């Protein structure tokens, strides 16, 4: 395995851990805030993904400091990951156009 491919793999593993830990902690931050809805694990899990993907429907979102601090980590994980895959694909493609020119 080439590095770009390892780091994407690493980032996909690490993204999943962030999505799960994120779900757990979002519920743990958000319970105790009256009106908070991000307060059960299953939909937390859905929230974490709609967050890391930057889709962000807003059906759900945090309203407490630590919710928001957890949310900011999920986003960054999301964006970094979905930009290391791109960087990896860009390096795979560049490699293949180098061979198709003889280099």
């Amino acid at each position, epitope marked *: 395995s080439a590095l770009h491919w390892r780091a994407a793999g690493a980032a996909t593993v690490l993204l999943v851990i962030v999505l799960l830990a994120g779900s757990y902690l979002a519920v743990l931050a958000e319970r105790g805030a009256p009106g908070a809805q991000l307060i*059960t*694990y299953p939909r937390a899990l859905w929230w974490s993904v709609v967050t890391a993907t930057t889709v962000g429907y807003g059906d759900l979102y945090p309203v407490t400091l630590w919710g928001r601090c957890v949310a900011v980590v999920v986003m960054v994980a999301g964006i970094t990951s979905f930009g290391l895959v791109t960087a990896a694909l860009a390096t795979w493609f560049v490699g293949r156009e180098q061979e198709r020119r003889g280099h």
Partner: antibody
Amino acid sequence: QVQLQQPGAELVKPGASVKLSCKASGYTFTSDWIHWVKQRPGHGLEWIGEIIPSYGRANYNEKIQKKATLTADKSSSTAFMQLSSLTSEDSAVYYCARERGDGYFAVWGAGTTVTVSS
Amino acid sequence: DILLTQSPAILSVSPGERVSFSCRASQSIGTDIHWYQQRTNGSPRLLIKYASESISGIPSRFSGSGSGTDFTLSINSVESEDIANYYCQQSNRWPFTFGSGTKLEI
């Protein structure tokens, strides 16, 4: 196998305090919340508070006076609720109940009848 | 804090007849309503979760229905064992809240 095990009764002198136990058997998870629910005679169910024994965080009913303080013993699988400086208002049955963090109370204890008198 | 309203408080029905209990949320809670039975001197017992879903253990005689603000627990053909106090309970917004309850009476 009875999952939530609670004392039948505690007598308490007005002004005094009391620690209610709730020993849990069956599947435990990290995810699990223990809840406490107050029922005065001929009245209905009131949500007091919740604790997650794994991380030890608890939350309580703002909407009522904050008599209670919640604790767990990770090792002995027990939740405690500490009701302090009681009066006859506080004379009720206190149920504990297990919620998997998915919103419903799947299982309840038999509750503890707490009587505040001299 | 979401307000659960159970009218009527008492429900008089005849043996084997269909009965329905109403639970109205002060604001849309989706399907995040749960129904409990409490007989005299008993602890509460989950009948229905997320408005409609059966609990295994519970007679098929029991159903729920509803979305948003209007919810309904129904018993097709009531019998004596059904005599108890019914409560609804929301999980949609912190903190969880309970209905004031309704007495089934044959």
